[PDB]
């Protein structure tokens, strides 16, 4: 992550220290020159197509429209969050793609009144949007036969993997396709390789071989997203031109296999948007626990996920209540956890549930905590687990920071029950 | 679970498929009856006292509250909806306890306004409530050294934990009550036992020795929650009168000790109304994947958490749309998914994420799966994730259901963020 001294950028500790009192506590804050600087590494591409279930809000989505980026809907809710923010599949039809392995009937009626190409990610999704809008523009998602990471797990692909269609049921995706006289616009894929380049090469190879065995012309292919981002102190970031010379390659082959161009998109959520996003939360109660250190502040697992949900390592650092710099404080092995009456409300655990420590400066009720790298499935993942509202959002473009979401309130949250 | 054609409950095979045709799809589905009956189980205890987070829907905590029960928030959001529920400080004190590890500024605002009793789990917020609320009546949440299942994993109690005063930290908690003249009613522990009656008198005999070992006067004590219930066949319900022997006998104890008689409080969640619930969803795409038979549902992990978060089990059913039985039919082992663009959204998946099948009748889309027992922490945990929103509910009372929560809209979520 980046320091909140070193910056550049406008993620400061005096920034930070500031928006509380102006926006509220617990808030997410964005940077908006992170978010540019991401998409331009990017600029190989032909497409950079934004899944915004990692970072949704409209103006967020809005920014990237500006910057050329289009996006990527998984949901009704998100087809709606791309025309809020400007897109529009009259004037440009690819501007949004519908992605999913299913399709229920509202989305069915909403893509077809629009005419927002499909890529589908089941056969029966291909048969169910086909017998509504015959001609419809699709793309297919094809699961190649394995995945990322192990492989007895839940799995962007393999057999253990609920995405895509497989590649031996290609023949019958193609009868489907024939059917309805389905337009194929691309063939895609979505398995995620982070900075394990060996791997990328694989599910390039898979989508050269899938694409020409299947021997349908088509006019684009996609690399689909999992571009990593370096959460923790050291790690590798992504090599952006690494990624570009090994997916033009195998659009490269495509091409010469079909006699004419094949665009090439990638579909980042992670890359664009993680490192733009910090989360910042107040310490509320601070206390021994035995041996455990235990700091206590007002944001939890309905609002960040990610530690509950997967051990999920992000960066924290403190801010000194009354501003002095903690910089080279000494450090105590912390455990920080929020609010919520559960158990699993720790934000220093591993995978599996094991609490652990973080070296940090000794602060004390009223200081505050910045969870770093939030950007990506941050906001987007919150609940309203133990009827905590929806947190507000705070967008900076050049020093100035800007609401970009009100507070939701609980009277909002029970007028769905006042009937 | 129970069983849809066994159905003494309004939860039957014939009920539940009509449903989703008249409220829409997926839906959660309650039956109060089920309440009720949970409810009964613990009339031996003085108070029954609702964990509302298990299940907090206003209608049902209207349900609560007309059968004797009395609700614990933990947190703003919770209290008002125990005051949108008819629950009253003004003219019953004891009615609503605030109960936390933490308190923010506007909780306290709240509380010291409608003098509602406040639940300490850390000498810091006494502290805090204290100096805004001099005199206030609070209780004592103490962690006793110890909580439930693996020690080194996060945990209801133990040092790896962050609920609830440290048993020696005490003379700490003495200090600040004397301090603001805090008025002590009650010392309260949540670890939660299940069905380990040995592991639950040990929680009944740390709180017999904290009590007197502490030394202070007190009208009460509460054995927090933790009941569990039998997801899977064959397991043991709990024996609620063995669960009234034994903090019976430690409420005893401590009525011996004080000289005067000591209320008894239980705080059940799960207990009172997991088993009522059932969550509703369609078929949308069924597929193979290599050797996998996968099952894809138009509900996923924003909307039934524990599989994902946890490796839950859920009893799973199949309603075929037409309405034959499909009790008898013949089952193919099945991984059941569901529509989020997210490989952690299958409902079939042990703690720690590995696959897993379901013997299940062999559905297509349009027909329908039950997941049952989803009355607790099913609709709680719900989030927006992947921009889905918040599902409608639905309480079946004597053979009529009716709405008790409306489907929230993207409208409604994008009203946030159009300022
Ligand atoms: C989540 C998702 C992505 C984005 O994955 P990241 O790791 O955030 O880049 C891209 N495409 C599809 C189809 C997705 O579901
Ligand atoms: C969650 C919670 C409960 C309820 O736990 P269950 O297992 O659902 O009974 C009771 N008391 C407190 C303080 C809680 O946080
Ligand atoms: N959400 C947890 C319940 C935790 C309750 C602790 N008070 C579960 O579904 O098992
Ligand atoms: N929610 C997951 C991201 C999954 C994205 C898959 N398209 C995480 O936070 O790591």
Redesign the pocket.
Known sequence: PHSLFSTDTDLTAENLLRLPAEFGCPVWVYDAQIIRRQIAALKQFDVVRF?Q??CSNIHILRLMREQGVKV?S?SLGEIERALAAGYNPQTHPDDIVF?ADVIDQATLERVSELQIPVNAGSVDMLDQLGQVSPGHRVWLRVNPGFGHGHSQKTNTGGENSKHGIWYTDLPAALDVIQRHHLQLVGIHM?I?SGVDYAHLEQVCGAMVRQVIEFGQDLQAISA????SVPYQQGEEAVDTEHYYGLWNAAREQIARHLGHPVKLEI?????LVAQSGVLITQVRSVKQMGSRHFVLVDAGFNDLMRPAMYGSYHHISALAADGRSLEHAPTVETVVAGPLCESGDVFTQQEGGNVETRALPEVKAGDYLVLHDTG?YGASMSSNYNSRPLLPEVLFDNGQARLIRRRQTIEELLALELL
């Open positions: 899944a279930k990692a990527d998984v992605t979505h995620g689909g997203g999992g571009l579909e980042p959520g992670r890359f990506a």
